[PDB]
Design a protein around this ligand. Sequence first.
Ligand code: HEM
Length: 154
Amino acid sequence: ELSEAERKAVQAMWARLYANSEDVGVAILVRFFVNFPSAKQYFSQFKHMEDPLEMERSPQLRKHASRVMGALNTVVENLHDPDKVSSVLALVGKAHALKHKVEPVYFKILSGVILEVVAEEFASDFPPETQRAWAKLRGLIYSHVTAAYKEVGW
Ligand code: HEM
């Protein structure tokens, strides 16, 4: 789990992100789909879309952006309550394993894009203590999502 200082570091960072949650979520996903075109295969309204301006304006992209940011928000705000973070990430993990059939490695890829976007957009607020805290959060997400895939015999 995150230590108290790490949790505080992650929540303070996340608050800055979430002040324009909508735009940050979308910028993250556009970068994800441009840089990893294979990930678009799970999205019916944009699986063959290439123009990043259209991706930015895509209703189904912006919707998934809103749901990624909201589920992340739930995890970050409730990091002091580890049963809640377990709860949320299971539900996500399973859902993506079973309904959406997404290869679990795409979570690792998306997290790397999330890191790249955070490092760019909020660099002057991203000291090493915070970078390390954020990296623990990423590990936490990937291990919990990865355990949920194993749980239903992926
Ligand atoms: C931090 C990681 C992610 C979070 C928190 C997240 C969150 C969500 C949530 C809350 C939903 C709506 C409920 C549901 O139908 O499951 C959703 C839908 C979906 N997600 Fe994710 N997601 C993540 C990563 C991914 C990745 C990497 C992919 C595939 C590359 C993906 C593919 C989908 C698809 C195909 C849907 C259905 C969208 C639709 O109904 O049009 N997600 N996501």
